[PDB]
Design a protein around this nucleic acid. Structure first.
Length: 87
DNA sequence: GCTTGTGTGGGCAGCG
DNA sequence: CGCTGCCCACACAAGC
């Protein structure tokens, strides 16, 4: 969301000082959308996929419509969400 | 090239 | 009081 991504505590709230854009889940690529679930391994699972996510969580390749045709790389999903657990 | 579709961008209510 | 769940309008890219 705007407040923060579905990651594990990514309070990366829109900060122009930080190089990130704000995208929505790959709604239209549900199967692939679903692995995002897996990377959102947070107990208190953040919003669904209508909320938005920021760029730092995926590979630049898979960023968005700039991928292959008009959406992500269907074989890529946010993997940069978080290392293990914040302190 | 312009219009339409999908992505982009952000919000409100109830309980620790 | 903030967070989670779901929706609309505009610009860019494709079609006519």
């Amino acid at each position: 969301m705007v407040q923060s991504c579905s990651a594990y505590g990514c309070k990366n709230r829109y900060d122009k000082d930080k190089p990130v854009s704000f995208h929505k889940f790959p709604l239209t690529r549900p199967s692939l959308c679903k692995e995002w679930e897996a990377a959102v391994r947070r107990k208190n699972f953040k919003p669904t996929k209508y909320s938005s996510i920021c760029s730092e969580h995926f590979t630049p390749d898979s960023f968005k419509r700039e991928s292959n045709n008009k959406l992500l790389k269907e074989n890529a999903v946010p993997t940069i969400f978080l290392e293990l657990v914040p302190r």
